[PDB]
UniProtKB/TrEMBL annotation, chain A:
The protein's name: Uncharacterized protein
UniProtKB/TrEMBL annotation, chain B:
Name of the gene this protein is made from: pdpA
Highest taxon listed in the record's lineage: Bacteria
Organism: Francisella tularensis subsp. novicida (strain ATCC 15482 / CCUG 33449 / U112)
Name listed for the protein in its UniProt record: Uncharacterized protein
């Protein structure tokens, strides 16, 4: 039923009330998954309530990218400049424990900058 | 768009967005169309 919720959104890329069952299908999930939050965000794409699901995607993707930033035991040079490109992109733009988890990447990047 | 449909993928995008404007500068060097917009 849960991965089969993306079975109905596969038919959305295959009409207004027929996509209404696909309307709350991208809204029942965000009210309650990594690849599912990338494909189903494109299910609604191809009024303002649709982009309300996109902000839920753009939020935890960086937190998932913070897990990819927590998994940065690859010590490169452009990657470390890309690490500033992931942190200073939302410093003007953009949940309590993730903020304390953000300092973990802040120390370990400089620890790896001291290592390499 | 092959990689599109972690942070290393967008490292190829910056190589695309760089020389595309340089290729657009060639399209800007080829602006012998004299419009207003």
């Amino acid at each position: 039923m849960i991965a089969v919720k993306d079975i109905t959104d596969l038919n959305i890329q295959d009409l207004t009330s027929e996509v209404i069952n696909g309307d709350t299908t991208p809204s029942s999930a965000k009210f309650a998954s990594y690849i599912i939050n990338y494909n189903l965000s494109n299910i609604n794409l191809i009024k303002i309530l649709y982009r309300k699901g996109l902000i839920s995607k753009l939020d935890y993707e960086k937190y998932k990218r913070y897990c990819i930033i927590s998994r940065f035991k690859n010590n490169i040079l452009y990657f470390s400049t890309n690490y500033k490109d992931s942190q200073s992109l939302k410093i003007a733009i953009k949940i309590l424990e993730l903020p304390h988890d953000y300092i973990r990447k802040i120390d370990v990047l400089l620890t790896s900058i001291d290592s390499a």
